[PDB]
Every structure is written in structure tokens, then in C-alpha cells.
Amino acid sequence: GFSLHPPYFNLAEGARITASATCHPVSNAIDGTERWWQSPPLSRGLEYNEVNVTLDLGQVFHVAYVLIKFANSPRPDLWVLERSTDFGHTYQPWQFFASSKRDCLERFGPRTLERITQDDDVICTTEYSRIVPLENGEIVVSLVNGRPGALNFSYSPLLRDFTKATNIRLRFLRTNTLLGHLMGKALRDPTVTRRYYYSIKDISIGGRCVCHGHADVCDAKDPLDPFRLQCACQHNTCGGSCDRCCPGFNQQPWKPATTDSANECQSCNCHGHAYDCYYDPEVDRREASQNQDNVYQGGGVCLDCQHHTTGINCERCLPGFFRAPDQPLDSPHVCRPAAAH
Ligand SMILES: *[C@@H]1O[C@H](CO)[C@@H](O[C@@H]2O[C@H](CO)[C@@H](O)[C@H](O)[C@H]2NC(C)=O)[C@H](O)[C@H]1NC(C)=O
Ligand SMILES: *[C@@H]1O[C@H](CO)[C@@H](O)[C@H](O)[C@H]1NC(C)=O
Structure with missing residues (x-):
């Protein structure tokens, strides 16, 4: 790069x-x-x-x-x-x-x-x-x-x-x-x-x-x-000054390119429950965010988790909802609402 x-x-x-x-x-x-x-x-x-x-x-x-x-x-x-x-x-x-x-x-x-x-x-x-x-x-x-x-x-x-x-x-x-x-x-x-x-x-x-x-x-x-x-x-940057990352690419902080690395923006992970995210240094330093491969090597935070989901990567169900064992985290049905008594 x-x-x-x-x-x-x-x-x-x-x-x-x-x-x-x-x-x-x-x-x-x-x-x-x-x-x-x-x-x-x-x-x-x-x-x-x-x-x-x-x-x-x-x-x-x-x-x-x-x-x-x-x-x-x-x-x-x-x-x-x-x-x-x-x-x-x-x-x-x-x-x-x-x-x-x-x-x-x-x-x-x-x-x-x-x-x-x-x-x-x-x-x-x-x-x-x-x-x-x-x-x-x-x-x-x-x-x-x-x-x-x-x-x-x-x-x-x-x-x-x-x-x-x-x-x-x-x-x-x-x-x-x-x-x-x-x-x-x-x-x-x-x-x-x-x-x-x-x-x-x-x-x-x-x-x-x-x-x-x-x-x-x-x-x-x-x-x-x-x-x-x-x-x-390029490098997944946006802004027409390329001074910021593009929606979806915030796992890492933004950086200008050096001779050594392109420093291109990385994609955050929201298990198919969000369209955007943002970088949180605390979270990254705290190692509490999943990258694309599912490792905690970033600082991306999903905004507006959809599907009764919630969490840094929208990996949990909002309290009150339960996870269908028969479904994968990306399912738009991962979390089902409370059943009748
Ligand atoms: C020529 O350009 C200089 C800029 O270097 C102008 O200088 C400024 O003049 C105003 C007068 O209102 C001062 O308030 C500024 O502090 C000046 N700048 C500096 C040197 O700090 C100058 O007005 C211009 N004059 C001509 C030739 O029209
Ligand atoms: C540019 O700066 C880096 C870090 O300060 C240094 O490692 C590199 O050698 C510099 N480039 C050169 C060779 O001038």
C-alpha cells in the first residue's frame, strides 16, 4: 500500500x-x-x-x-x-x-x-x-x-x-x-x-x-x-477530500495514506442488522467489537440495530425478545417477540 x-x-x-x-x-x-x-x-x-x-x-x-x-x-x-x-x-x-x-x-x-x-x-x-x-x-x-x-x-x-x-x-x-x-x-x-x-x-x-x-x-x-x-x-474513504470513511467502514479510525500502508477503512460488522456505524476509540481499546471475520480487532459500533437486535455488533436481542435457536444471527428473524403465556 x-x-x-x-x-x-x-x-x-x-x-x-x-x-x-x-x-x-x-x-x-x-x-x-x-x-x-x-x-x-x-x-x-x-x-x-x-x-x-x-x-x-x-x-x-x-x-x-x-x-x-x-x-x-x-x-x-x-x-x-x-x-x-x-x-x-x-x-x-x-x-x-x-x-x-x-x-x-x-x-x-x-x-x-x-x-x-x-x-x-x-x-x-x-x-x-x-x-x-x-x-x-x-x-x-x-x-x-x-x-x-x-x-x-x-x-x-x-x-x-x-x-x-x-x-x-x-x-x-x-x-x-x-x-x-x-x-x-x-x-x-x-x-x-x-x-x-x-x-x-x-x-x-x-x-x-x-x-x-x-x-x-x-x-x-x-x-x-x-x-x-x-x-x-479510494481506500473506501469518502468526503471528496477523502477525509472520512464511508458508511459501513468504521472498524478502524480514519487515516491519511502513507508510503507504507494505504490505511484504507475497514468494514464494521452488524450481522446484517444495520446500514451504518461509527468508530469508538474506547470500544477499540476495550476490544469489544467484532470485525468482518468475527475477531475483536476493531472499534466499530453499529447504529440503529434493526430486527429487535442490539449490541455493539447487533449480536444480542433487545431485552424482552428471545433468540430462535432455529435461526442464525443474520436472520431478519433472529429475535422473536415474547410469546403468549
Ligand atoms: C496591501 O496588502 C496588505 C496585506 O499584507 C494590506 O495590509 C493590511 O492593511 C490593513 C488595513 O486595514 C491592516 O488592518 C492589516 O493589518 C494589514 N496587514 C498587515 C500587514 O498585517 C494593505 O491594506 C494592502 N494595501 C494596498 C497596497 O492596497
Ligand atoms: C519517514 O518517517 C518514518 C517514521 O518517522 C521513517 O521510518 C521513514 O524512514 C521515513 N522515510 C524516510 C526513509 O525518509
Whole structure:
């Protein structure tokens, strides 16, 4: 048994994108043309050195990498790549960007520099901030590469959580005003501020559905809602996130799949007197439940025993009823009512 994972695809493609400032609308980013979105030049703009491009995704996916591609503009000097696990609230940064290693601590924090030690470490790289390439500049943030977990992902919850997301945001804080226009720019001269802005011509986010290792394909069940995907769950899981077992399969607790075992849901046993059940840890630890083979190696509890039956596996007769010796536990007549005197 091993984990199953649906293919990666471009989360960008069918997402909602927005820009705090814009005048080349935002869409040009996520579409596939050579067109592009472009912020208002520092010229008639004071705080237009701080913009925010935002992508909203349907559900919550696992993001493998965010790739930005700049057009008529050099990469920015200071920006923040942020995600969201809410659908637009408690943001969190993924990585920080700065030209001067000192700028990091000055603008972000003292600790924002230590190398990656723990799967959910943030960081403040420089590399992607050297104005040098001032045209078609590409940045590739890989949320997985490096991290200690990438090795044995399956057993690294921190990473798995670090990579989830609902919204992804590009927070630009300061243009990469380099060369020697500093004085002009600082002074606010319309010969330097009219050649400084932001230009994205493509935002490509590689990610995939979340299925806890119980599915290798997830499509859209409804043609009318082409972007809401649902896992084609396996391992007897259910939920379209495969986060729960299916009716009838609760002998064991639910688990995501690891490299070692599929961890598929086991079927509880109700001697043909029930349609559903639930897992009770106490019962399992107490060894008081029959599995399919009739051994007490589980924790399944039948709900609504039918046929005047009752018990963890509906193996007994409700008090007041008696078991027909001429009948087997599965008979819909196992238990007969009290006879006349
Ligand atoms: C740019 O995006 C940032 C998100 O990083 C926004 O910052 C938030 O601004 C609100 C103002 O109501 C504050 O309450 C939040 O605390 C800010 N987030 C932070 C840094 O904690 C900002 O509003 C956006 N501005 C632009 C460019 O439109
Ligand atoms: C994954 O983690 C398990 C338990 O922590 C460990 O036995 C296994 O060797 C790890 N995978 C590898 C080889 O990195």
C-alpha cells in the first residue's frame, strides 16, 4: 500500500485575481497572452510603491510553487509572498524578499534570516531582487524544495500544512529603484518616477487537490461549476477530500495514506442488522467489537440495530425478545417477540 496523489495543474488558470492599484488590467497576468498588468508609475503616485496582486482559489489546495514572470519592469526590491488558509482572513507570509540582507531585519525581523531548519520556516532571500534583469524577469518560489520534509513528505505534517492555501498574494512594498536615480527618485522628479512601476505578465501556481493520499484524480463533478474539484476517493474513504470513511467502514479510525500502508477503512460488522456505524476509540481499546471475520480487532459500533437486535455488533436481542435457536444471527428473524403465556 502506498499514497495516491492527484496530478499538479495550474491553480492560476481559473482563479479570481485582483490588484489594489492597476493603471493593462489584472487579468493579463493569469491569462496566457504576452499582455500584462502594470501598476501606476511612481510619478503621480505617492504610496504606489506598495501594491497587492491577489489570487483566490476555489477550495484549499496544496501549492508546490508560485512562479511570477515580469514584463516591462525589473523584479521588485521588497515584496512579501503570502498565502491564506482561511478564505480571506488570517494571512501568513511564505517568503520575504530584499536586496540588502540588512533591509530584511530592518523591515521584517531579526530572525527573518536564519537558514531553513524547520518545515514551516519563513525566509528573506535576496537573489530574486537584483534589478540587473530589468525586463522579462522570472522568480520561482518553491514552497517544498529545501525543507527537511521534502525527503519523506508523507510523514511531515508541518510541510503538508505549510503548503496548503486558499488565497495567494503578492505583496509589493518597494520598487527596485537602482542604478543612480536615487536622488532624483527620492526628490520625486517626474523623469525618474515615470519609469518606476510593477509589471507582471504571468502568474503560474503549480498545485494539486488535497486528498490525504486517497486519490490520484480529481475533476469537476458539475459542468456548471467547472472549477470546484472533488477527489475520486479510494481506500473506501469518502468526503471528496477523502477525509472520512464511508458508511459501513468504521472498524478502524480514519487515516491519511502513507508510503507504507494505504490505511484504507475497514468494514464494521452488524450481522446484517444495520446500514451504518461509527468508530469508538474506547470500544477499540476495550476490544469489544467484532470485525468482518468475527475477531475483536476493531472499534466499530453499529447504529440503529434493526430486527429487535442490539449490541455493539447487533449480536444480542433487545431485552424482552428471545433468540430462535432455529435461526442464525443474520436472520431478519433472529429475535422473536415474547410469546403468549
Ligand atoms: C496591501 O496588502 C496588505 C496585506 O499584507 C494590506 O495590509 C493590511 O492593511 C490593513 C488595513 O486595514 C491592516 O488592518 C492589516 O493589518 C494589514 N496587514 C498587515 C500587514 O498585517 C494593505 O491594506 C494592502 N494595501 C494596498 C497596497 O492596497
Ligand atoms: C519517514 O518517517 C518514518 C517514521 O518517522 C521513517 O521510518 C521513514 O524512514 C521515513 N522515510 C524516510 C526513509 O525518509
